[PDB]
Design a protein around this ligand. Structure first.
Ligand SMILES: [Mg+2]
Ligand SMILES: [Mg+2]
Ligand SMILES: [Mg+2]
Ligand SMILES: [Mg+2]
Ligand SMILES: [Mg+2]
Ligand SMILES: [Mg+2]
Ligand SMILES: [Mg+2]
Ligand SMILES: [Mg+2]
Ligand SMILES: [Mg+2]
Ligand SMILES: [Mg+2]
Ligand SMILES: [Mg+2]
Ligand SMILES: [Mg+2]
Ligand SMILES: [Mg+2]
Ligand SMILES: [Mg+2]
Ligand SMILES: [Mg+2]
Ligand SMILES: [Mg+2]
Ligand SMILES: [Mg+2]
Ligand SMILES: [Mg+2]
Ligand SMILES: [Mg+2]
Ligand SMILES: [Mg+2]
Ligand SMILES: [Mg+2]
Ligand SMILES: [Mg+2]
Ligand SMILES: [Mg+2]
Ligand SMILES: [Mg+2]
Ligand SMILES: [Mg+2]
Ligand SMILES: [Mg+2]
Ligand SMILES: [Mg+2]
Lengths: 121, 209, 56, 114, 127
RNA sequence: GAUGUCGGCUCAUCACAUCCUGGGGCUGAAGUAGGUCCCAAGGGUAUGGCUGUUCGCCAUUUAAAGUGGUACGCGAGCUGGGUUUAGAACGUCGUGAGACAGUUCGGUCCCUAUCUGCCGUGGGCGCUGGAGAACUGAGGGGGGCUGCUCCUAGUACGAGAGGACCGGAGUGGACGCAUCACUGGUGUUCGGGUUGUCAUGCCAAUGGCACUGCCCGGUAGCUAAAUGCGGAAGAGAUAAGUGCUGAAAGCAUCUAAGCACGAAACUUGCCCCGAGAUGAGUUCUCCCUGACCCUUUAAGGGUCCUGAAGGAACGUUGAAGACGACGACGUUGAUAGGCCGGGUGUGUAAGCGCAGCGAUGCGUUGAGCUAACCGGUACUAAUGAACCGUGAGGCUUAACCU
RNA sequence: AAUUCCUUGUCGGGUAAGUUCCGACCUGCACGAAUGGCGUAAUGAUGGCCAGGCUGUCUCCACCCGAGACUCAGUGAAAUU
RNA sequence: CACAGGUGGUCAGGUAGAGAAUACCAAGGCGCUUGAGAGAACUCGGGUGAAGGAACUAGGCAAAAUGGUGCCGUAACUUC
RNA sequence: AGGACCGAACCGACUAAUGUUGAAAAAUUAGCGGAUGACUUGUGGCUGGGGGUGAAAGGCCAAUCAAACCGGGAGAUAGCU
């Protein structure tokens, strides 16, 4: 969701705040949604965990404020602006477990590791 | 090549869990040929048809006489098609509200855009802006007009100078029709549809391809 | 800003080509001395069809 | 049109939710959901409620969850996201609908106001 | 450009109109016929009509409301007891707009605006 | 007797020496990717850090982040950071006043548009009797972007590594148009809460003012972040290029005759405008068939009687609108307002009763109030006429005809 | 460095990225001791840099309330030519 | 100029308040010598804004923001 | 106690918008600095032009200041327009 901006980490190893710096997916991407990969910058980290301040990786957006909605138009929306890091050249999720509820748009066979953690939809 | 009657509001049909379906439900009562244009005389092919019949007690004479066959009947508008093989009716020999479109084809709703009225370069075309740091005179509104200098400024009769938005036709083109209702003539489309309340509208066949 | 040279008279008149005039001399009276506009008679002595509060 | 245009709407949402909401009801608004490949299966959602009531698409009932993080659904009323009928929490509708408090702890809506 | 059924009009600040009509409407009941401007006239309907209509059985709850929209007991009484029932039988349409035009002071429309009245007596129904 | 500097913003328009996408030739071209040259201007062609910068370097995107012209496009359009006023200072120069193709902090950006030009939009008159309509389509414009994935096919190709062509299927980024049913924003005309205070005699209940006093929520409408659809296929003729057949030149040769392919370019296809198309076109329907006079008599000029179809005017109005214009309705009526009902939004009024010392609470009660909304209703206003527009339509010729 | 031309010096720091900034080095084009030198708590509508908060400054504008702009009646300018 | 400017001193009510602030009012004085409609672009003065939150820009300019009494508690440094 | 602190009157003018043929030949609106002091203000008086005054900007000396305004020498001179 736009450059700058501040998300969380619904997984681990070097946590907390991590700013988006680039919305990937072609020129003039305006924002990123849940399911979208994004260029992040570790801006907090924990003394431990292989991830530390200033570090630049990619990351998906598991949850966010604008809210998901489709078919009928049921709109789930959180105020929990997620993330969940992504080690660079293989887009597999970097992190043991994952915190918080996710969604069915992440239900893709591409992330997968993500939707079988934090027991929730 | 298909009736043309006013629409009225839009809805949602939720079953199997679409609900995305945003029906336009544009009633399309009787059509009635009223006139059949042909090669010799009338000019080209065509085939008039006044798909209406709104009680019009007071109407100018020529139109009131524009009808002539069996029941007579009167409407208001007056469209036509072209090549085909439609009847020789008048406002008699009804057409149908169930034109041949099978069940899963794309229609081509055509109406007159709403009317904003005079509108700035901001609303007319998404190209405009300006900031708020200084010079409030030319605030976030007025453009910076036609470039050029010594080229006297033939202004290239365009850009996008402010001017009324118009009510001009639109023709959304391509819109899968969901329902029809043979006798309770409504015919639902999928969103779009220009105009409001009950604009004439046209709803063509599928030329968009 | 300003005119670069004097507008001719053929111009000022040609600019005033919309003087416009009314007075459709439409229905004035239906029961008085010819008075009343196309809608209300002479107030305090007018009425549409009949004496409204005051007449003569 | 009086009863012949708006008529399709009135002949679609033709349900029996509960004809009355008094918040805090953690109704597993069982929503058929679906998932993919097989399994129909449905799983509801804990609740609080704030809404809207209209357009035959009473697309509402913000159900605001507390599990892990936070909130919603504008779960209208029709189709593959079904039965919401349940009522498990009582009331405390003091400011009633459009109860935007969005707070996280000792802030209760003292139900049982019966 | 264009807008659509944004019913009622502007003139001054939001409060002025909803403050002026308090003076206007209340003035109408005091008399029969008034003299304002066509625009103000047609507008004075939406305010005077519900006043005429709010009068059915008072019940205090309404004499309280009538005293609220007009804020004037002087006329609030008329609304219920005398003015009220004069039309207790008929629906709406308790206002006439008899035009005129010509202000001279500024040259704009006028219109009197009134309402049928006569005298206070009692009889038995007839027709 | 003044043509305002650089850079930025806004908004552009053209070139082609083309950055991406499209089509080809050669390659030291297996494939994939490239190298180079030809053709090609339809469309597209990045956000930031540093700096006044243009540029540049750097971070990260992208199919790509083109070169250039347009007073190094663009100040009677914005900015005023750079750079030439007056203040002050450092370094340096000078005995000094002061100075610098050095640095540094501070430092007034005017103009109501007549003409051309544009974007919109009306009034005349003309199209040869006058009207109401529906078209034809000469022309004119808009639009033309492209990613990824899967199938083909893990096949052709390859030692592996890897991995197509052609053709097809889905989903995106940016852009464009329409529209509010959904999600939402607004919603100072709807409801509520509440602070201070003045008043309505007082309690109670209400109202004015204090940014709508502060604030919560919200109808319609308008709206984007919301939703739906579009840049296509298909044709004609081509560019480069590739070719058939075949002389000049017994052969050979894509050219000399003739033929065949061939790209986002060109013509068309799609959307809009469109008969002032003065070359003023077409078709359908409606209305007017009373008397005389003076001329300088085929030119008319003029009087009375007539005035239609229609138009306009006025009024009630509108999802239409700056004003004009345009749409609906005018008693044979729903065109506005009001009124009835419903919806909706607020959130259980007022009054009364009871509990509590009281604040307050409970019951009456999901009450009270409620807009631009939906269904309906002539209660109010849309009056009977009047106005303009006529009275059977020029000559010549061709064809058809009681 | 209010003094450095070369110059965005070189190294370190802050940053995803820092021609500015802070700490060093010294090669001071062209610092330097009352045309004062180096420090300095406090003060400053003083120059430069960073952060939190905050937000329509901005992505990208939407709606709304008012004063003009538009229409009518009255009065009635301007530069320029 | 019947000009949103300038001009010394005196007086000093109620509720609220630290108050000659500020808000609503007394006594008292006024609505400011063109008005009536409309409800476009655009200009001026404001209100509210989804998600983001300085990405704007020369610079956070302008906005938005903080804001009271009492009490707890408060760093480098220091001429104490 | 204090050229002490927050802040009205009062005094002053750091910022932005508007105005720029203005309401106004320097202001209005929202902020802003001082506010017992080198303070601020009424009345009257004293310094005169190469002269005055100046916490210093060539600032101020009646909308005039690198030499005021008025009258004179005066029809200065103008190889320039
Ligand atoms: Mg200015
Ligand atoms: Mg020229
Ligand atoms: Mg309106
Ligand atoms: Mg070329
Ligand atoms: Mg750059
Ligand atoms: Mg230039
Ligand atoms: Mg300017
Ligand atoms: Mg500058
Ligand atoms: Mg100087
Ligand atoms: Mg007020
Ligand atoms: Mg340093
Ligand atoms: Mg020195
Ligand atoms: Mg010193
Ligand atoms: Mg005055
Ligand atoms: Mg916001
Ligand atoms: Mg920046
Ligand atoms: Mg920038
Ligand atoms: Mg500021
Ligand atoms: Mg503020
Ligand atoms: Mg002091
Ligand atoms: Mg001030
Ligand atoms: Mg102070
Ligand atoms: Mg004095
Ligand atoms: Mg002076
Ligand atoms: Mg002299
Ligand atoms: Mg002499
Ligand atoms: Mg002389």
């Amino acid at each position: 969701i736009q450059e700058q901006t501040m998300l969380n980490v619904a997984d681990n190893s070097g946590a907390r705040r991590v700013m988006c710096i680039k919305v990937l997916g072609g020129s003039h991407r305006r924002y990123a949604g849940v399911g979208d990969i994004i260029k992040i910058t570790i801006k907090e980290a924990i003394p431990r965990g292989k991830v530390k301040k200033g570090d630049v990786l990619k990351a998906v957006v598991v949850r966010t404020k604008k809210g998901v909605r489709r078919p009928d138009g049921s709109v789930i929306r959180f105020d929990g602006n997620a993330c969940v890091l992504l080690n660079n050249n293989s887009e597999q999720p970097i992190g043991t477990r994952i915190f918080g509820p996710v969604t069915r748009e992440l239900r893709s066979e591409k992330f997968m590791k993500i939707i079988s953690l934090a027991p929730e939809v | 090549m298909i009736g043309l009657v006013g629409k009225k509001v839009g809805m949602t049909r939720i079953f199997t869990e679409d609900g995305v379906s945003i029906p336009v439900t544009v009633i399309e009562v009787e059509a009635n040929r009223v006139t059949q244009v042909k090669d010799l005389a009338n000019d080209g092919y065509r085939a008039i048809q006044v798909t209406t019949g709104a009680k019009k007690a007071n109407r100018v004479t020529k139109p009131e006489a524009g009808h002539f066959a069996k029941a007579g009947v009167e409407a208001g508008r007056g469209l036509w098609e072209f090549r085909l093989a439609e009847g020789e009716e008048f406002t008699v020999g009804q057409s149908i509200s169930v034109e041949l479109f099978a069940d899963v084809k794309k229609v081509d709703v055509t109406g007159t855009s709403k009317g904003k009225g005079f509108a700035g370069t901001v609303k007319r075309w998404n190209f405009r802006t300006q900031d708020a740091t200084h010079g409030n005179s030319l605030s976030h509104r007025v453009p910076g007009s036609i470039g050029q200098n010594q080229t006297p400024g033939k202004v290239f009769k365009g850009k996008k100078m402010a001017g009324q938005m118009g009510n001009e036709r639109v023709t959304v083109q391509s819109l899968d029709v969901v329902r029809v209702d043979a006798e309770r003539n409504l015919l639902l489309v999928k969103g779009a549809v220009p105009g409001a309340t009950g604009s004439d509208l046209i709803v063509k066949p599928a030329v968009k391809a | 800003a300003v005119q670069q040279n004097k507008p001719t008279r053929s111009k000022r008149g040609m600019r005033r080509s919309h003087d416009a005039l009314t007075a459709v001399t439409s229905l004035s009276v239906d029961k008085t001395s010819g008075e009343k506009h196309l809608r209300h008679h002479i107030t305090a002595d007018g009425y549409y069809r009949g004496r409204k509060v005051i007449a003569k | 049109s009086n009863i012949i245009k708006q008529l399709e709407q009135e002949q679609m949402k033709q349900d029996v939710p509960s004809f009355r909401p008094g918040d805090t009801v953690e109704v597993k608004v069982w929503v058929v959901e679906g998932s993919k490949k097989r399994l129909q299966a449905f799983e509801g959602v804990v609740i609080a409620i704030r809404n809207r009531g209209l357009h035959s698409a009473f697309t509402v009932r913000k159900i605001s969850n507390g599990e892990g993080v936070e909130r919603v659904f504008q779960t209208h009323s029709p189709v593959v996201d079904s039965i919401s009928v349940k009522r498990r929490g009582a009331v405390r509708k003091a400011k009633l609908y459009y109860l935007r408090e969005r707070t996280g702890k000792a802030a209760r809506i003292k139900e049982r106001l019966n | 450009m264009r807008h659509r059924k944004s019913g009622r009009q502007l003139n001054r600040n939001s409060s002025h109109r909803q403050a002026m009509f308090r003076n206007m409407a209340g003035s109408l009941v005091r008399h029969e016929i008034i003299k304002t401007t066509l625009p103000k006239a047609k507008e004075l309907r939406r305010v005077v009509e519900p006043l005429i209509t709010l009068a059915k059985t008072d019940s205090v709850a309404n004499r309280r409301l009538a005293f609220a929209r007009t804020r004037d007991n002087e006329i609030v009484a008329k609304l219920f007891n005398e003015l009220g029932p004069r039309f207790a039988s008929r629906a709406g349409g308790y206002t006439r707009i008899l035009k005129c035009g010509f202000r001279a002071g500024d040259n704009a429309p006028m219109a009197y605006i009134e309402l049928v009245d006569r005298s206070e007596k009692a009889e038995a129904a007839a027709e």
